[model samples]
Each structure stands twice: as structure tokens, then as C-alpha cells.
Target: TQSIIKNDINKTIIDEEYVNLEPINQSNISFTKHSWVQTCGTQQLLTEQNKESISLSVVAPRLDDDEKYCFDFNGVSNKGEKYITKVTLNVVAPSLEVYVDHASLPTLQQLMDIIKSEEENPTAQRYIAWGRIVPTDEQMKELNITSFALINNHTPADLVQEIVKQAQTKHRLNVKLSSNTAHSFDNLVPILKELNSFNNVTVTNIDLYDDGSAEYVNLYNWRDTLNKTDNLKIGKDYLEDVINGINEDTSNTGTSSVYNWQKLYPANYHFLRKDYLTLEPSLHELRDYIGDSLKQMQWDGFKKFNSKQQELFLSIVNFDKQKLQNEYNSSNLPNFVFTGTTVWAGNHEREYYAKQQINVINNAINESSPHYLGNSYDLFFKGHPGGGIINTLIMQNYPSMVDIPSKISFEVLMMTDMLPDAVAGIASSLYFTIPAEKIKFIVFTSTETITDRETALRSPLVQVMIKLGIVKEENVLFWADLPNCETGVCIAV
Candidate 1:
């Protein structure tokens, strides 16, 4: 019979232990050992072996809690027949539990921070709860994060709440709720508020904005303030008032009213207090970090394009703002990059309003129109990626305009010298990132025709951008501010 030794092959072992495998009906047996294929643990042959069996020892140098590892124990009987025995070992180790809420770029950065923190504390046993942004296999290996569960954007709010609650029941978790803006992680926001209420759990909210700015909010304070306030309306005046009150400290109250406000408005609401500021990297450092990451990400996609596509893509990547400005000085015609909005889809009523804006720009460039410049100007239309097909078809009506690929990130363009003389678009966070000195003007289309709520939300952001000198006050224009010609041309000034 090929079946040799019979001392149970499967065994549960602690960190470091030795097991004696004694053969029952076999003699003159030679044993060969194999390492754990999963590389979860290490094994060694302790002795040359008795004729009947051999002594084997296993160690979990970096074993995770309750992790299983297996290795083969091959034996050769005196009859020259081979008998194989598989030994599976289960290891138990102390581990720290970590739960992360979203898997955005910001969350990735936060994970790096957590890894560093653990390194300093030397927690050999570490486990992480993955968010919707599943890390690539390389990223998982590089970060050395062992994933426990997948909780993403599509996860039900109640289920996520339950997961967090149940996780807390066993061990305290280091929870990180991260997003590009306060508006992200909608399902996890309430859960974050609940986690903040617990004293035993450590919770942190990291908001890394697109413009290379970041903040850390005390969810406890944020939640407490929201519960106290009845009004959810965050208007331009209210935002400014809150900022001023926090800065001047003239409120005479220990608690600034800013703490009572919700993140329902612009991202600036999260920046009202100094304590919420990110302390690790300076603003410029974070900007460079984010910019480099964005560049690498875009280049990864850029490499797959054909030569012609690559050339077109390089035109934007290699754009020189200073050269464009010099050319505009020599020739009166300025370059423009108009960002297309998604309002053109589904809603015919809003589409007409959007078409009116497009018509205004088209007529302004026509030679016969009174608003026409002396020479033709360079114009590029970048459509929203989701509605690229529709936007490309619409751009065909205008012969002078060039359509940039939608897959290219507008934010990446802003980070480069590719910014045009003027950027005309509906309200976007992209406007906040454009350097005021690099661009000549920003033409903001009035969103009042679309939705009052959107207009109200955008108004504060525009004000904040102007105050921060990100965009000059005089250089900013609304659609209504342009001159309307009889030919239906609205010249942008």
C-alpha cells in the first residue's frame, strides 16, 4: 500500500512549534520537506530522521492571524515506492485591525501613511478592510496590506454600518475615511459620523482636494455641529461669515459657528478651522506629489495610443503657456479651451440653453460677425468623457474647433503649461486649480438657467477662488456679461 505513516498529517500550530511525524507501518523511510507554497510560513526538517518517521518543525516568521500554510512531506519506503503526505499548518498571531472607507488616490496615500505608522510601532500582524477602489496586485504587494473585505461605493449604507459595528465588537479598528472632497463617500459619511462617536475606535477623515490641497476634519465636531443646527443651507454669505468668524475669533464663543456647518457646500467649508489642516506635507509638497502621480497615471494610458494619437496628446502635454502668451502679444488672436458640460444629454430644455452658449461662441468667431476678431483664433473643445460621443458630434458643426480626446484628464492639462489664454466652462472644481497668472481669463456660464441650487453652490467657490487670487476678479466673466451682437454673437471679453 502507498499509504505510509498515519499520525494525523494536518495540524494546528502556534507561532513556533515542532511536530513528530512517526510512520505506523513503514520502515527505512526517507523524508523530503517542501516549503509552504503560499510563503505564509517557513518549515525545516529538525532531524535526519528515525527509520520509521521524521521530526519536522515550522515557524511563522511573519504569519497573519489564523492564516493557513501547507507544505509537502514526501517519503521513500525501503521498497523504493514513494508515499506523499501533505502537512497543513494553521498559525495564530496577534494582529491589528484596520478599516478603510474608499479607495481613491487620497485613500491610497492614507494607506501609505498607515503602513508607515505601523512600521514605527512594529505590528507584525496587520489586516485591512479594502474599499471600492481595489488596489492593484502590485499595489497590494508594495503596500504589504492583507485585505480582509471589500466594502465599496456600491455597498449598502446599512451593510457598511453593520460591518463597522461588528468589527468593533471584536477589536478596536484604526478607521480611515478618505475622499477627494467632502462630498465623496456618501454612503460612508454617516458611518464616519457614527464611528467618531465611539471613544474606543480611532477614526480619521482625510480630505485630499484635487487642487493639491488637503485637510483633516474632526468628524466628532462636524457631526455635533450638524446635529445642533437645523438649517442645511450654506450660502455664499454664510460661508464667508463662518470663515471670517473663525479667523478673527471675534465670536467670543469657544465654539466657532463654522463647526456647526455641514460639508454640503463647497470644499472651503472644511478649511474654516486651522486645527483641521493637514500637517505632514506642506501645500507645495502635496501639490508636487499629486501632480507627479497624475502625470504618471496619464502617461500609463498615453503610451498605448498610436503615433497620430500620441502626437495630438503631446500637443497638450507639451503646451507652453509663456509661448502662447508671447504669440498672443504678437498676434491679437488668443487661444481658447472650452470644457463641455453634460447638460447636453437627456434634458432638451437645458440642451437648448447649452446650444445657445455654443452658438454665441461660434458666431463670435465668424468673419462676417461684428464680434469677430481680425484673425482666426485657436479653439479646442474638451468634452466630458461620459458624453464624448454626443459632444464630438456637436463640435462637428464648427469647422474651426478641434476636439481633444475625452479620456485625457482636464486636471492634468491644468497642471501643465497646456492651459489656454482663456478657459470657458460651466462651474467646475477645475477652475480652482488654474493658476491666475498663467491664464488670461475664465468665462463662467451662468448656471441659473440649469438649477438655482447649483448656481448657489458655485457662487461661493468662485468668490473663494477670487479672494485666494487663484483667478483675478476682473478676469472672471459670466455669460450675461459678454456683448451680444445682432448676428447672435456674444464676444467674450
Candidate 2:
């Protein structure tokens, strides 16, 4: 029998440092065959073998601080016995500090950016300061972020100040400020300006919102351009509401008032809308900006899925596609897939009302009503992943409509050859991913009044879709307008 023992091998190494492994054989047996299996890291191995021992050496690849590399060495002795040994190498480098306000879409994007940058230059050290929400253990492991300090409940301005103080002490440190840390804070300009004055320390501000509203741009460009009168009016209204124990008036016509109430309190609210009259850049400009940015980012919304999750998604998609194909062939009718939404906590009651109206339309379809293209269409239901119990209720209520698994992404389904003839929804971001030219028709529910609350028309997302030409204005229909539908479905005049 032959056995190998590890001797004087360094388990930990600095970036690009060499790790030596000399395996001593208990019985002077010369290994006939030897091989290496590297599970992680990029390291070139050099080896030497003799009757007594085998010498193996490798230079560790450049890696971020605390990142690990692992490999196994297997040897077949001359006596036909096998020996295996596993070695793990830990690489250390200088530390870099990162600060984030919350775990949001922008923060995730920033984390990806940091990871890519670190990949290019492995020696760069980056630390993380978690604010509000801390990353899960799995997220930390997947992202390869080892060092994180929690600064929960701290305001963005205070978080930046703490990071700045650390930078001053370190004298030469790389710092990353997340979107919220960079954009959402007041009195941040002076602190960032001061940090910039440090000759050795480098400070980078990650764009807060990816919707073309960059923190740096907003801070540097629009900070002075804010409408003072509008700002004072908002403040005055908010204070009056607080004093009177009442909310801001919502009776103003159109969705503008709805948006106003939602965004009234943000410090940078004035920068988002133009002249307090209408949204800036128009909806068209905003759409183009978001499209261009997502393209540049090479955004793959599904890239975060693990192998098992990916396989499941693909399987669900394939199954749904085949089912839809079968149904389309059997019926020889135009198929429409209406996506479902959730009404959690009684929030978004507008969506619930819209669904009730949709149920009315479904009833008409069931009765084979001869209303405009109604009886000629086959309606399908695709539930939202977050729809939870509501999706189950919908599946139960709508037996005629084929139910696609909510776990499967609607965006993935839209890309398939079995694309629906028409896609209808209240307001789903998934609709933004579908190309306008691909589908024959896109229908949306937009109500002027349902308990004084509107649905899709009030959604900024739907507004973008209209401006992007993804949904034609004529296709947007109100529940009250459903009865007067003509060919291609005209909205009520």
C-alpha cells in the first residue's frame, strides 16, 4: 500500500505567490502516473518526481483579498495503489471599501460592475458597507465579497462621511459609493468634493438609478436647475397635510397628480420632472435612454439563475410553448395571453379592479359574444411569480385559459416562436422586453376612474411603452370602452 503525506506546503499565499507541495511516500514507491485537478483559480503547475517523494509547485493567480483557489493531486504508485491529496490556496491583497444604502436593482448593478472590475484587476481590494439591508450569506459567497461592515439605519450622508473618514485614515484606498449613497442624500456634494481633494484616495460614485438618471449627472448638472417654486409648493403642501392629519389632494385630473403624490417627498423629485409641468425628456426620451443603457449593460435578467433554476425555467418555457402550439392548432383562433398581477395588502386596488373587468371580458368570451374580435380570440393566462394565492385563485376561476407556471418568466415566453397574437396586461415591466413588431396586437387596461384610481395609464412603465411605440395609443382601452369595441378595438369616444 502507498500513502502520501503533505510536508512544508504553504496553504495560504499572497497574489501571484508560489505554493510548494512535496508529497512524501511512506513506502519508497515511485508514482507511475500523476495528475492535477484544479477546481478554482488560474495557476500553472511545475512538478518533479522521484522514488521517495514528488515535488509539485504552482504560482497562485492574482485574486481579490480573501478569494480562494483549490486543487487536488492524485498519484498512482508503481505498486498499483492510488494516493490523493487536496490543497486549497487563499490569496490576500490590499483592501478596498464599498458603501451601499440598500439592496436594490441599482445596487445589484453596481455590485456586478465592481465584480467585473475586480476580475480585470484581481489585486484590487474592495470592502463593503451595508446599509438598511444586509446581503444574505449566499449572495456574499456568490459575489466573492468577504469583508462587509453593517451600518444599518445610517442615513446616506452619514454613511458617506464614515467612508470618507476611513479613506483619510488609509491615505490611499479605493472607495465605491452605491446609487442611494451617491444620489439620495442631501449635503453630499461638499463631502464628495472634499474626498475628491484627497490626492491618493480614489472615490467612485455608482449611478443610483439605471433609468438614465445618474447620480453624478444629476448632482453636477441639475442641482442648480431645480424649480424653487415647485419645491416650495410641495414642501408647503406636505407640511399642511401633516398639520391637518390629511393626505395631499388627489382630485386633479390625469395620472400626473398620482405621480406627484408618489414622488412628492423625494429630495431630488424636482430634478425628475421638468418645470413641474410634465415629465422631463418626455416619455420618448426616457424610453430611449433606458433602452440604450440596458443594451450597453448587456443586461441578462436571467443570468443570476443557477444551473438548476435555469434548467427549470427552460423546461417550463418549452412545456408552455408546446401547449400553446397545440391549443392554437386545435382552435385555429387568435391567441391572447393576459399576464396576472397580485393584490397584496390591498395595495394596488386599481389592478384588482382591472382584473375584475378582465373577468367580465372573459365571461363574454365564454358566452361566445360576437363583440369585436371577442369570440374569435382564445385567451390564455400567465400568472405573475409574486401573485401567490391570487394566481392559484385565477387558475381555478379560468379553466378555459391554459395556465403557464408563474415561475417561468413571461419575457422568456415572449421570445419564443409560439408568441401570442396579442398580449394584454395592466402594467408589467415584462411587457417592456417584448418587441412591438413581433406581436400582432398589444392590449392594455387604462381606466380614468375606478374609485378615483386609474390603472395602466397612470403607470410610468406603460407611459414608456407608449412612447417607445411598443403599445399604440389606440390599443389602450378602458373597461367602460370594452362594449363599444370595433375591429382592432376602438377606445370609447
Candidate 3:
């Protein structure tokens, strides 16, 4: 006898006067005393501004006695036409709870199957769904998907029907959708409740998704950050230090402090993984790594030299002008020409890496000699596909930057196998995937964020890069010209 109520019990009449409501003269419905007030229940759209609709939440006095109830809708408005309608109410048990990871079609089918089992078991009063994905208010708005969509060749309504079918038969349904796809919880709940109505189903309660999935994975990755590294060459001590740092330094223990830095990726499957994603680096990290790399390279460069040559190199490391001029003029052409770094570009509010890079390029192009500023678009600036957005907002803000074609894909540049001098950016774990060995790469890092460096260093793959010949500790550069390095970002191997 229990039934879920998906919506507020409603009564509507077109072109009707709502100024005055009549008394309940019917035999089974004299519950509320006297004549009806202008409004009684929640969210009544019957204010003086509009008078065509009336909403009510009429609870039967005793569901146990008659197990059913009905109320006649009789309104009196001397100025408008007269009409009557009757609404039926049912006695539904308290809803049950249904927890689901997602709301995909297959998953919805699984949900339906679960409800079918529940009909036999009949445990809870009703059912509810809580997780990353759930049905939302925009069932219709989101229903923009038509009949031919590859999803299922089913319309949105069709999909809803399947979802409603599995809801425990007479029991109501409630759900808590914890995600951003549906922004507003209040706005989204009602529509989801409505979606249950088409099948004579009732939905009374609803919940929300609060980045709980990410936090869950953050904790998962935190504990398993180095699960694969025990067998690798990564120092066990180093790994433990990072794990400890993550737990102590971060506000959310077992979770990455930054929302984007959550070391997880989107899983297309129905179930969620505890440690499903791998690690990637950030700009500041590469800065530290790049600095050490450049120093290592500097040391290696002198490895072929004697004690006197090594000293000479160390003394001249600060001789910026001489090095810049010599590298630019060299017929051999420098192996790489990085624009700059972003980690500490300005006051920390924005990045000056692009400006610093553009300035470097402009100076090279304006060189008193036939400039080594290569005409290759791919080599000049390796910008992010979306870096253009940052370029206009921050890089363009600098008047001294000489803008040029700065966008190109990695695949186009990697095919040559030899890039003597070029710029690159959009720092992160993505760069670690590049295979162009010993090539000069112009990139930068941030000093403010350690998440990138921590992530990169912790990556088992990056460690693999170190243990293997893919990338050496000494094959990278950080500060091309420290004094002229307005942005504390640099290019590296």
C-alpha cells in the first residue's frame, strides 16, 4: 500500500479565479477547517500576480485506516468561471536508500536490477541513490539527446523510463548526486523527482555529490602513491618523505590540497577506482628538477675537461651577456632557446614567463648580427593549445613582448629528431611523456606550487626516465640567463 510521491500534490485550472477558495464539502475531505485560504502549501504559484494554479500538500489523516484518500478541488471566484477537480492521494512508506557510483545507462540498468531484487527482499521503506552521477532536474533539458544518439538509440524520456522501472515498485526514490555537471542542488532535485513521476513512481528525498570522489581518490593515491615504486629504483626513503609531506602539509590529509592536482583521471567504467590515476608534474617542480638538471649538465660538460676547465666554467656561469651573445652568434646554434619560466614570474598573482620569453626572443631577433632567432614556428614557441588564453590575459599585458606565431603541436615538432633551438611550455606530467632526447627545450616552472614537482618526482614513470637512458638528471636547464630571467622559469633538456 506504500507509494512514493514524486511531486508536491498539485491542482491547476486555466482561466480560474483564485481570489477566494471554497470549503471542503466532500464526505472524506473536511480535514482543514473553514474556507480555504489564499495559499496553504509550499511554493504555491497562486500569488495575486498569477491565479491559474493552486498547490497543496494534503496528507491523509490516517493511511492505516482507509489506506487511501481523495480531495475534491472546489474554488470560488465571483469574477471568474467555475470549475472543479479531484486529486487522489496514496499511502506510501518511508523511502529507502540506494547507493550508486554513476547514473550511466548500463549502470541505471544495474540500479533497476537492484530494485527488482529489493522488491523480493523488501528491506527498506523506500530507495535512494547517492554517488558521483545521478538523475538531475534537467531530465528534459539534458534530454536534448534525441532518438538517434549513439548512447542507446533511446530518447531521454526512454532512458528515464528504464531508470524509473527499477525504482522499488511502490516505495519512493531519493538520490544525492555529488558532482558539478548539475551545478545547483536545489534546482536539480525537483526535476529528478519529476522524472520518477512518468512511471507512477514516487521520489521524495534527494542528496548531493561534493567532490567526495576526488577526495576519496586523493586519499587512495596518497596511500598508494608509491605502490609500484617498491620494486623500482625510487628510493624508499624519498617516497616515504613525500607521503608524509602530503599528509602533513595538505589541509586534507590523504587528499591532494589543490583540486586540480588530485592524482586521478576520469574512468569510463561504471565503478570508481581507489587509485585509478597516475602522477604528473607541475611547473615549480620542473624548476627545481631543471635547476638540478642544468647543474648536472654543467658538471657533465666539464667532465670531459680537466680541473682548471671546471673552475673556469664555474666562474663564468654568472657571465650572462658573454654567454648569451656567444650562444646566439655561434654557427653551431644553441641546442635550445627557452622563453622563460612561470613559477615566479611576478608577484605570484600571474605568470611573466611568456613576457620574459617574448623579450628574450625580441632581443635575439634584434641582435646586432644575423640573428640565430630561427624562423621555424614550431621551434620558436611551444605554447599550450589553451595557452593563448593565458597569453592574451597575462603575456600580452607586457608591452615589451614581441608577439609571433607561438602555437604548435608536439607531434609536429617531435618528428624532426633534432631541434637545435626552440621554445616550449604548458608544463606538467605531459612533458615527461616526450621522447625527444637531449634536445634543448624552452620551458618554465613555478616557485609557488610544489604540487607539480612533488607529483613529477613521485611518478614511477619519471623515475623510470631517470633509471633508463630516456632522461638523465643532468640533461635539463632551468635559468637560461638568471639576471634577464624576469620570470623564474627556464627551458631544459
Candidate 4:
């Protein structure tokens, strides 16, 4: 049987096996490397009710993903064998939100688990933010990505918006700023201003976060390979809508994303209060106003301070803000810094600096000091969201450790490091603040404790540290029997 073009244009296919029906993104059934799977040697008829055309959705390919297609279509022309018409197809880049993680990297499996688990939610779409990882090209294809982390420090907003601007013609655009950039008021303001300026995208929601739990994802660079029902480009649009919102807003997650990361001192820090930006304190009455707020709310650290300490701390903070204003010329957020440990509320966070870890910190600070880690030293402590009342649980052993603010950032993403146990507490929090090469992470685990119900109490913080630093198999010392559990410390890196 021979096939002709619509309306008798005299275009006929003579051969079944050799007939060519080439498509730009489609693959031939003929087994070869040009496509992922083959779909050749079959002929289907076209009709007024339904046109015979195979539909395909395209995505951005990652560093290692495959991106090729093969097809075959043969026809006889009325004009003559020499007279030929050429057909061309336009390529649609995948809709994407290239996630950027400042403090950690997540594995493809980790992200897959999150996505799969979130399916029970009843929204039109699902959104997630991460201290997550970048997916491999293979993972990207499998996930049909729209949200994942970037492997670089460059924020995804500019590129995301630029690409969405072009995609809006073919699809509805969903655009959101990176949560990583939202921490700093300076960086955040610019993003809001830009969001307002977008021509096609919509600002559907405004989300704020206090805890540092945010996800990282990238779909902008994904390549199409999933089996989807709708030919209407299955899901990059939905992904953008959700990924853009997953962490599109600025918040505490911003603390994890800077070169110079430090906080004023944790007093139930709300990363997006924008209230002092709102409180409108005048230069003359600023101290008086702050003092009143300190006495009234009596938040975490300020209440413990005597009148003099409060004044001094406030003065220092105000002065730092001014310097920051002058330096950046914009009011942005800084990082989380030393949370005081005088009271149980704030002290609770220090519980993870296990006595052994504290001894190591004190020793390391002393070793690094020109003097003896100083009669008084500056120790960096990160608080775990899991609260505890052990004030000295973390810092008590190291008297030299100060509760003053200093500067910090990571040499590598702390989340990727492997740990002996997952009990993060103080260990996990400090991973991002310390230099990985200078320290050896210690995990004290008993055969009973490591796999017992308490694993939840210890896994995340430890696993996160494991990914952040170099922990050789030998470096992981364990087998502490609860009865005679004496795990000696080895501080040498």
C-alpha cells in the first residue's frame, strides 16, 4: 500500500521497511545510538478526525545525559524527484528552577525519596526547598526535573527569569527568587523588585521560613525522557510553578548561602521579620526603643543580659548594622551566629558538642592560638533546632569559648560529609561553620545505640557532617559498650 499527502498532493510512501518519517526529537524503532529507545518499521494512517503525528517534550540535558533523536519518512513528490520541501521543528527548552545549595549537597536518592513521599499532598502541585543536592544527568531524566540544586554559587533567579520570559509564549510562567538569596535584606529587596517587574510570571505566594530546612533543585537544565500522557509538554510548567515557590522566597535559609555568614545573636531570630525595617526607630530614640522591646518580649538571649550588657550588645549590633549599610549600601540579612547559653532555651542548642568534641575544640583553638587558644577563646557554636536544657552540654568544658559574634563560612558544603552516626545535634550544626580539613569528626556509637530507636535522635546531624568533611574509615572510632563506654578522642586531622 502507498500513502499520499493530504488533499492529493501526490506524496506517497512506496516502501514499508524503508519508509522515512524523520522527527527532530523522536527516535526510530531501528536499534541504534541516536535515540534512547527505538520506534521504527510501523506505518499508521492520518485522518480528518485525528492527524498522525507523534508528540514529544524536550528538556535541557545535563553534563552526562543523552540528547539525540532518529526518524525516517519517505515520500514521492508530484513536482518531481528533484523538487523537495524541507520541514523543520522548533525545540522547547525544559522549564526549570536551578537550585543552589550554600552549605550542603544532597544525593539523587535523597531527593527522589522526598519527591515520591510528597505525592500524598492535595495541592494542584507540590513544592519543596532543600539544603539539598544537585542531580546527575541520569537522575534529572528520571525525575523529570523542574527543581534541583545547581553545582555552582551563581543564583538561579536571573537565568530562571530570563528563560521563563522566553517560555511564557508557549507556557504559563512561574517565577520565584532563590530562598538562598532571601536572607540578606539587600539581596532580597532586589529580587522582590525584579519579581514585580516581570511581564509574564506571577507571584502566587510569599513564603517565609525560620528553621534552616530548605531544599535545592534544578529543572532548567533537565532533558526530556519520561513517559508522559499529555503531549502538551508534560510538566516543566508545573515544575516551574512549584519549584519557583518551593523556595522562591527569602528567609532564614539565606544564612546558609553567604561568603561572610554571621548573626547578631539568636533571640528567636525571624529571618524575615522586616520589622526593624518596619519598627522605624529614629536615631535619637533607637536605644530606648530597643531596650523597651528587650524588657517586654524578653526573647532568648537579651533577657539574660544585665542592663549594661544589653546596652553594649545593642550598641555593637547597631554599629555593625551601620557598617553593613555603608559596605553594601543595602539592608540585607547576615548569617546565624553565637546563640548565648546562660539559659535553658538558648543553652539547649549546645547539647551536641559532646564532652569529647568540646575537649577537641578547646584543644584545637589552643593549638591554633599564638597564645594558649587564649585564656579566653572565640569558639564557634551552631545550635540544633532540636532543643535541650544542658547549658554546659556543649560549651561548658571549654571556658575559653566566648558567646560573642564572629565571622564564618564553609570550605566545602558541610552536608556531603559522611559521619559515623547521624546524631547531628551540635556536631551537624558546627560542620558548616568549621574548616573541614582542620578537623576530624568523631562519632561515639554503641552497636545497640547505632541501630536502635534513638537513631532518629542522632542520624541527620552526623550524616550531614559526614558529607561535609574528610572522615576516613579509620577515623570513625566506635564500639562503645553502654556499660563501659569510654570512647577516647582523636583530634588530629
Question: Which one is best on lDDT?
Answer: 2
Write one digit per residue (lDDT tens) for candidate 4, span 41-156.
12232222221333222221121221232223333333322111222222122223322323321222123222442232211122223333433444344344445233243334
Which runs of model 2 end up more than 4 angstroms from their true locations?
Answer: 1-335, 343-345, 348-351, 354-357, 360-378, 415-418, 438-464, 472-475, 484-493
lDDT string for model 1 (63-151, tens) is 33456666555555556565555666665443233334332333333343444544443333333443423445554554445554544
Question: Residue pairs in steric clash, candidate 2?
Answer: 96-125, 96-126, 96-127, 179-208
Candidate 3: regions farther than 4 A off: 1-253, 256-355, 359-375, 378-390, 393-423, 432-442, 446-471, 480-493
Quick one: ranking by TM-score, best first?
Answer: 2, 1, 4, 3
RMSD (CA, angstroms), candidate 2: 12.0
Prediction-by-prediction clash tally: 0, 4, 22, 52
- lDDT, candidate 1, at 267: 21
lDDT of 1 at 226: 42
Instruction: Please name the candidate that would achieve the greatest TM-score relative to the true structure.
Output: 2
Worst 10-residue lDDT window, candidate 3: 290-299
Question: How would you encode candidate 3's per-residue C-alpha lDDT over 227-278 as one tens digit per residue?
Answer: 3333222332322333334323211211121221111111111112111222
